[PDB]
Design a protein around this ligand. Structure first.
Ligand SMILES: NC(=[NH2+])NCCC[C@H](NC(=O)[C@@H](N)Cc1ccc(O)cc1)C(=O)O
Ligand code: MG
Ligand code: MG
Ligand code: MG
Length: 76
């Protein structure tokens, strides 16, 4: 089963920072990163990447080091 990395809205990080982090960590374009940031902000969370459990563990670690609230879970 594939897994997903989820980023959760938090009250401290800047919207602008989160958009930048998605570009920096995943290479996403600015429209893509902005859309994911706004999904987190307006829905409370968003899937930001998908793949094997092991690969999502890395994405979670990278996001934590950037200061974002990230978890992973199995995709159903
Ligand atoms: N640094 C700072 N001024 N903090 C106060 C809040 C700033 C505000 N940020 C938000 O509204 C965030 N909730 C946006 C956000 C955080 C995390 C994630 O993952 C997505 C979105 C602002 O930017 O004005
Ligand atoms: Mg907010
Ligand atoms: Mg966060
Ligand atoms: Mg799903």
């Amino acid at each position: 089963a594939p897994w997903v990395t989820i980023v959760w809205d938090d009250p401290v990080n800047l919207m602008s920072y989160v958009t930048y982090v998605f570009q920096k960590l995943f290479g996403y374009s600015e429209p893509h990163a902005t859309k994911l940031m706004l999904q987190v902000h307006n829905e409370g969370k968003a899937v930001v990447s998908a793949g094997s459990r092991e690969s999502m563990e890395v994405d979670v670690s990278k996001l934590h080091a950037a200061g974002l609230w990230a978890t992973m879970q199995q995709d159903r």
